[PDB]
Each structure stands twice: as structure tokens, then as C-alpha cells.
Design an enzyme around this catalytic site. Structure first.
Site, PDB file in Angstrom:
ATOM      1  N   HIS A 111      56.072 -41.546 -60.911  1.00 44.01           N
ATOM      2  CA  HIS A 111      55.180 -40.810 -61.807  1.00 44.01           C
ATOM      3  C   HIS A 111      53.908 -40.589 -61.009  1.00 44.01           C
ATOM      4  O   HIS A 111      53.493 -41.478 -60.258  1.00 44.01           O
ATOM      5  CB  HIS A 111      54.864 -41.646 -63.070  1.00 44.01           C
ATOM      6  CG  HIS A 111      56.088 -42.105 -63.792  1.00 44.01           C
ATOM      7  ND1 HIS A 111      56.610 -41.417 -64.863  1.00 44.01           N
ATOM      8  CD2 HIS A 111      56.916 -43.159 -63.588  1.00 44.01           C
ATOM      9  CE1 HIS A 111      57.709 -42.032 -65.288  1.00 44.01           C
ATOM     10  NE2 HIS A 111      57.921 -43.092 -64.528  1.00 44.01           N
ATOM     11  N   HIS A 143      61.946 -33.939 -65.004  1.00 44.25           N
ATOM     12  CA  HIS A 143      60.839 -34.802 -65.338  1.00 44.25           C
ATOM     13  C   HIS A 143      60.073 -35.671 -64.209  1.00 44.25           C
ATOM     14  O   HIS A 143      58.946 -36.096 -64.206  1.00 44.25           O
ATOM     15  CB  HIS A 143      61.277 -35.765 -66.425  1.00 44.25           C
ATOM     16  CG  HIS A 143      61.840 -35.074 -67.618  1.00 44.25           C
ATOM     17  ND1 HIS A 143      63.159 -35.151 -67.972  1.00 44.25           N
ATOM     18  CD2 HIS A 143      61.240 -34.288 -68.532  1.00 44.25           C
ATOM     19  CE1 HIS A 143      63.344 -34.444 -69.070  1.00 44.25           C
ATOM     20  NE2 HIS A 143      62.206 -33.901 -69.424  1.00 44.25           N
ATOM     21  N   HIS A 163      58.898 -46.772 -59.879  1.00 46.63           N
ATOM     22  CA  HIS A 163      59.738 -47.598 -60.751  1.00 46.63           C
ATOM     23  C   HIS A 163      61.118 -47.761 -60.134  1.00 46.63           C
ATOM     24  O   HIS A 163      61.825 -46.758 -59.903  1.00 46.63           O
ATOM     25  CB  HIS A 163      59.893 -46.941 -62.122  1.00 46.63           C
ATOM     26  CG  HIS A 163      58.631 -46.958 -62.900  1.00 46.63           C
ATOM     27  ND1 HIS A 163      58.381 -46.123 -63.977  1.00 46.63           N
ATOM     28  CD2 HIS A 163      57.536 -47.747 -62.766  1.00 46.63           C
ATOM     29  CE1 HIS A 163      57.178 -46.388 -64.465  1.00 46.63           C
ATOM     30  NE2 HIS A 163      56.651 -47.370 -63.753  1.00 46.63           N
ATOM     31  N   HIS A 187      62.348 -43.822 -59.029  1.00 43.64           N
ATOM     32  CA  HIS A 187      61.652 -42.561 -59.249  1.00 43.64           C
ATOM     33  C   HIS A 187      60.164 -42.860 -59.303  1.00 43.64           C
ATOM     34  O   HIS A 187      59.734 -44.014 -59.233  1.00 43.64           O
ATOM     35  CB  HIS A 187      62.131 -41.919 -60.569  1.00 43.64           C
ATOM     36  CG  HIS A 187      61.791 -42.770 -61.738  1.00 43.64           C
ATOM     37  ND1 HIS A 187      62.649 -43.716 -62.250  1.00 43.64           N
ATOM     38  CD2 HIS A 187      60.668 -42.845 -62.476  1.00 43.64           C
ATOM     39  CE1 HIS A 187      62.074 -44.336 -63.255  1.00 43.64           C
ATOM     40  NE2 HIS A 187      60.862 -43.838 -63.408  1.00 43.64           N
ATOM     41  N   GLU A 240      51.273 -45.120 -64.720  1.00 43.10           N
ATOM     42  CA  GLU A 240      51.535 -45.373 -66.138  1.00 43.10           C
ATOM     43  C   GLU A 240      50.834 -46.650 -66.590  1.00 43.10           C
ATOM     44  O   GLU A 240      49.982 -46.616 -67.485  1.00 43.10           O
ATOM     45  CB  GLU A 240      53.034 -45.417 -66.368  1.00 43.10           C
ATOM     46  CG  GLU A 240      53.649 -44.071 -66.039  1.00 43.10           C
ATOM     47  CD  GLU A 240      54.945 -43.822 -66.782  1.00 43.10           C
ATOM     48  OE1 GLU A 240      55.893 -44.621 -66.631  1.00 43.10           O
ATOM     49  OE2 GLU A 240      55.022 -42.805 -67.521  1.00 43.10           O
ATOM     50  N   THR A 288      59.594 -45.712 -70.426  1.00 39.56           N
ATOM     51  CA  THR A 288      58.394 -44.908 -70.624  1.00 39.56           C
ATOM     52  C   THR A 288      58.707 -43.441 -70.852  1.00 39.56           C
ATOM     53  O   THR A 288      57.778 -42.642 -71.010  1.00 39.56           O
ATOM     54  CB  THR A 288      57.424 -45.066 -69.454  1.00 39.56           C
ATOM     55  OG1 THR A 288      58.038 -44.521 -68.286  1.00 39.56           O
ATOM     56  CG2 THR A 288      56.989 -46.501 -69.243  1.00 39.56           C
TER      57      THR A 288
HETATM   58  O1  LIG Z   1      60.896 -42.421 -66.361  1.00 43.05           O
HETATM   59  C1  LIG Z   1      61.393 -43.416 -66.516  1.00 43.05           C
HETATM   60  N1  LIG Z   1      60.643 -44.620 -66.245  1.00 43.05           N
HETATM   61  S1  LIG Z   1      61.465 -46.032 -66.552  1.00 43.05           S
HETATM   62  O2  LIG Z   1      61.083 -46.690 -67.886  1.00 43.05           O
HETATM   63  O3  LIG Z   1      61.491 -46.892 -65.250  1.00 43.05           O
HETATM   64  C2  LIG Z   1      63.071 -45.208 -66.818  1.00 43.05           C
HETATM   65  C3  LIG Z   1      64.341 -45.675 -67.019  1.00 43.05           C
HETATM   66  C4  LIG Z   1      65.301 -44.737 -67.220  1.00 43.05           C
HETATM   67  N2  LIG Z   1      66.597 -45.238 -67.403  1.00 43.05           N
HETATM   68  C5  LIG Z   1      67.610 -44.495 -67.538  1.00 43.05           C
HETATM   69  C6  LIG Z   1      68.677 -45.379 -67.623  1.00 43.05           C
HETATM   70  C7  LIG Z   1      70.169 -45.024 -67.809  1.00 43.05           C
HETATM   71  O4  LIG Z   1      70.592 -43.925 -66.979  1.00 43.05           O
HETATM   72  C8  LIG Z   1      71.918 -43.406 -67.071  1.00 43.05           C
HETATM   73  O5  LIG Z   1      72.165 -43.430 -68.490  1.00 43.05           O
HETATM   74  C9  LIG Z   1      73.492 -43.355 -69.115  1.00 43.05           C
HETATM   75  C10 LIG Z   1      73.189 -44.076 -70.357  1.00 43.05           C
HETATM   76  O6  LIG Z   1      71.785 -43.901 -70.333  1.00 43.05           O
HETATM   77  C11 LIG Z   1      74.621 -43.978 -68.321  1.00 43.05           C
HETATM   78  O7  LIG Z   1      75.816 -43.676 -69.077  1.00 43.05           O
HETATM   79  C12 LIG Z   1      74.366 -43.412 -66.930  1.00 43.05           C
HETATM   80  O8  LIG Z   1      75.411 -43.672 -65.915  1.00 43.05           O
HETATM   81  C13 LIG Z   1      73.131 -43.997 -66.333  1.00 43.05           C
HETATM   82  O9  LIG Z   1      73.345 -43.662 -64.952  1.00 43.05           O
HETATM   83  N3  LIG Z   1      68.273 -46.574 -67.483  1.00 43.05           N
HETATM   84  N4  LIG Z   1      66.920 -46.505 -67.293  1.00 43.05           N
HETATM   85  C14 LIG Z   1      65.079 -43.357 -67.171  1.00 43.05           C
HETATM   86  C15 LIG Z   1      63.859 -42.871 -66.979  1.00 43.05           C
HETATM   87  C16 LIG Z   1      62.926 -43.773 -66.803  1.00 43.05           C
HETATM   88 ZN   LIG Z   2      59.370 -44.491 -64.681  1.00 47.42          ZN
END
Ligand SMILES: O=C1NS(=O)(=O)c2cc(-n3cc(CO[C@@H]4O[C@H](CO)[C@@H](O)[C@H](O)[C@H]4O)nn3)ccc21
Ligand SMILES: [Zn+2]
Length: 258
Positions: A94, A62, A117, A92, A104, A196
Site C-alpha cells: 500500500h 487494487h 504486507h 503486496h 495503513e 484491510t
Molecule cells: O490488501 C490487503 N491487505 S491484507 O489485510 O494483508 C490482505 C489479505 C488478503 N487476503 C486474501 C486472502 C485469500 O486469497 C485467495 O482467496 C480465496 C479465498 O479468499 C482462495 O480460494 C484463493 O486461492 C486465495 O488464493 N487472504 N488474505 C487480500 C488483500 C489484502
Molecule cells: Zn495489505
């Protein structure tokens, strides 16, 4: 039929699997600068990234993300609208297919070429999985990218993208200093929102920086050569991986500056 950003699985479809997509505190939003309220009670952000330990860079299908060691208070965000200490987990981006789209959040309806982000989680909840279930679990620092001069602190990222072209690929990515990605000013807008991407959990305090960073056309070009698809599948370029602005509903956007 997994979610994504295409015609048949894009943001307009996500509500079928994640009904919170139509919730009351969804992100991103348009920041209307004339109706945001200056709040003199907001503190300066405190960004303490000097001991950050980056681990890996990954193409997750993604976006691409850089992960950090979050087992101790090494790289933390405090202050601003936050109570307590938030540890940096990953960053990461976008981005768009053309320079006039990709962010975004928007500012007075203006779109930037990309958005960075930096995702942090509230240490009072012990692990990130617990934090995503709480209304104050995460704090995301959002930084706009505009096309201009090169950003030298981004070049180490750009140069490794060839090795993570397709979904599932990862590489060692140690000794990267995220301070090289920050603008000069830390003035910000803040509002309560969501992730998001699915699962779209309403657990984020957003902190969006007013000052964009500049990156060169050649740097953004490299983002646009990544692939949504896994190795061996038909090539589909990873572009336009952004969610459109969502209704503000009953929320106020606050500004740290006037
Ligand atoms: O594209 C995006 N833009 S954003 O809103 O900044 C965002 C946040 C996230 N997040 C993902 C997570 C959790 O990630 C993992 O999730 C699991 C549980 O979810 C743990 O057990 C694991 O160890 C952890 O590493 N926290 N924020 C993912 C994608 C986007
Ligand atoms: Zn993001």
C-alpha cells in the site's frame, strides 16, 4: 459500482456492502507506543523463507501482489504470538501519492510512505479459504517503508512493474527471494485484527515490525505509475490505496521489546 479508494467507492463506503467494516477488530490501527504493553512471554518470530518459490506477479486493480507456491511447508512463519505453522501465500504493498502518506498502520500518528504486507495462512485449516473464516486463520507481517537509500532486494520487483501496468495483467515472477525485504531487527507489535480490504474478515493476527526498511525516491516513484484502470480505459494512477486507522475498541497492542 465495485469498491476502491476513490471519492465515491472508498473506505468510508465499504460498510454498505461489508457491514463488518464497523466491527470490533478492524485494521489498521494507530500504534500508541506509550500504551502498548511489553509482554515478556512473547517468543521471537521464526521466519523460514529459504525454500520460498515465487510464481507470478499480478496487478489486481487494487495493489500488485507476488504469489507463492503454498502447497507445502516451503516458506513459513512460526513463533511470536502464533500457535502452529503459517504458510506464505503472497505479498503486496500500500502506498501514497506523497512521501508523508501511504502506510495503513501508523506509529504515534506517524504515517510512512508505504507498507508491505506478507500474508500467511494457518495450515491447520487446510486451505486459505477455510482460514479466512477463523479468528486465527491468517498472520500478516507488516513492514513500513521510508524514503531514503535504495533497497537492492526490491529492485527486481520495481523493474517488472512496466509489464503489469493495468488491472488484470500478470507476469511470470520466479526465483524471487523475500528475505531481501526484511529489516535487520524482527522486534514487533502484535494485535488481533482484520483484512484491510474487502471482505474485511476478522481473521488476522497482525505482526507489525518496528524497524522500517528504506527505499529510494526512484523506487517508490515506480509504484505510483501503476494504474487502477484496465487497459483501454481512462488512466487513473494507482496511488493512495490505504485504509485509514480504525478504532482500537477492546484490544491491547503488545510489544515484543521494551
Ligand atoms: O490488501 C490487503 N491487505 S491484507 O489485510 O494483508 C490482505 C489479505 C488478503 N487476503 C486474501 C486472502 C485469500 O486469497 C485467495 O482467496 C480465496 C479465498 O479468499 C482462495 O480460494 C484463493 O486461492 C486465495 O488464493 N487472504 N488474505 C487480500 C488483500 C489484502
Ligand atoms: Zn495489505
Amino acid at each position: 459500482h465495485h469498491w476502491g479508494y476513490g471519492k465515491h467507492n472508498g473506505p468510508e463506503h465499504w460498510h454498505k456492502d461489508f457491514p463488518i467494516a464497523k466491527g470490533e477488530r478492524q485494521s489498521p490501527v494507530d500504534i500508541d507506543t506509550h500504551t502498548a504493553k511489553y509482554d515478556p512471554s512473547l517468543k521471537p518470530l521464526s521466519v523460514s523463507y529459504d525454500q520460498a518459490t515465487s510464481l507470478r506477479i499480478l496487478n489486481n486493480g487494487h495493489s500488485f501482489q507476488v504469489t507463492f507456491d503454498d502447497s507445502q511447508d516451503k516458506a513459513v512463519l512460526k513463533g511470536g504470538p502464533l500457535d502452529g505453522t503459517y504458510r506464505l501465500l503472497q505479498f503486496h504493498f500500500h502506498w501514497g501519492s506523497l512521501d508523508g502518506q501511504g502506510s495503513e498502520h501508523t506509529v504515534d500518528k506517524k504515517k510512512y510512505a508505504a507498507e508491505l504486507h506478507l500474508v500467511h495462512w494457518n495450515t491447520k485449516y487446510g486451505d486459505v479459504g477455510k482460514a479466512v473464516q477463523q479468528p486465527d486463520g491468517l498472520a500478516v507481517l507488516g513492514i513500513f517503508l521510508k524514503v531514503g537509500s535504495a533497497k537492492p532486494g526490491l529492485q527486481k520487483v520495481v523493474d517488472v512493474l512496466d509489464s503489469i501496468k493495468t488491472e488484470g495483467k500478470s507476469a511470470d515472477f520466479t526465483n524471487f527471494d523475500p528475505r531481501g525485504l526484511l529489516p535487520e531487527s524482527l522486534d514487533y507489535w502484535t494485535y488481533p485484527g482484520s483484512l484491510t480490504t474487502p471482505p474485511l474478515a476478522e481473521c488476522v493476527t497482525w505482526i507489525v515490525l518496528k524497524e522500517p526498511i528504506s527505499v529510494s525516491s526512484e523506487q517508490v516513484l515506480k509504484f505510483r505509475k501503476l494504474n487502477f484502470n484496465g487497459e483501454g480505459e481512462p488512466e487513473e494512477l494507482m496511488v493512495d490505496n490505504w485504509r485509514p486507522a480504525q478504532p482500537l475498541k477492546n484490544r491491547q497492542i503488545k510489544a515484543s521489546f521494551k
